Symmetry: D2
Subunit: 98 residues, 4 copies
Amino acid sequence: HHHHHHMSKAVVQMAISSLSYSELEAIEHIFEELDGNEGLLVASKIADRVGITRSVIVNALRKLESAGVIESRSLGMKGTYIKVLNNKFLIELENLKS
Amino acid sequence: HHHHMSKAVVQMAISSLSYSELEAIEHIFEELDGNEGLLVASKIADRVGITRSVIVNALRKLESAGVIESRSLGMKGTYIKVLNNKFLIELENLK
Amino acid sequence: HHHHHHMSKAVVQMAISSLSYSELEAIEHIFEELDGNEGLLVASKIADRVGITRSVIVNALRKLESAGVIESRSLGMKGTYIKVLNNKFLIELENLKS
Amino acid sequence: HHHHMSKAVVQMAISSLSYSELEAIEHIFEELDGNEGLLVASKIADRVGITRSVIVNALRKLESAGVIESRSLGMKGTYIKVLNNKFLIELENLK
């Protein structure tokens, strides 16, 4: 049936295993402030809430993007515009919520 | 903590398998226990109805992924050891 | 320096290892009819040339897309519009040309 | 043919390493040969200038990827075997 999504799973799985614990924790908050597949992130709000520096938000972000799971864009000014490219991602995230 | 790389490795490995190759290990591994044991690809081809080659390179792939090991014995069988903790569970639910 | 591209490499590497030999061979031709990063593919021309059916072209294609290396779009009519999303891909391709 | 999954596995593994973790195995593995041997993470921390923990979980990751194995001995060392053919070359050129 399932058109072997696996590949998309694998990718996500990989992406995740590379995150640090702080980066992982940062990710669950980031993708919950999201409105489904695309949205806007203000890193300060996340940073303030979780008690970590924007670097870890930023880095978490890069790691994901470099694995091609997301794509993200400078809205200079206010936040950063995030778009999920991989359907299986939010499952895993939503899954292992701890 | 680290068990994601391992999941990844499994999904990576299992996702490079041809559809018929997936089917074939599906059965190799329903030939139970869950660590080690053996068969011959003759006895599963003349049995499930899939040629003895798809068995042989389905294996060759899991083994290239590091997911398993196999001393192919001296012709009288082919010994399989799952050396990847998580292959076990991650297999089960498959298509 | 290199902002750990690795992840993008890994992804590509993975994508590749899943292709069949015919699918691999099909890929080198597809991505050479390309004009750099994006372009247009007519699968029949490829099929005719390499002597394989459109299914393998199509499948090769899916595998890549599902690993998020490319994205591809129905131009119904004429060809299929292909876009490379991963910078490290064409290196590997261009690399292992055989 | 199949040696791509293996490359993949290596790039996968090595890409999950922290920058300092990469640096640390860089040296663990310049402590040469190219299959097996040992050290202690005490003797490389009080040596290269990186703490003994980054050594320990850099290892834990390569080993979760299946790239290596380690019986951590009985405190008097820590035995390392690269069990992945291609880790060898793929390491070399690193950042």
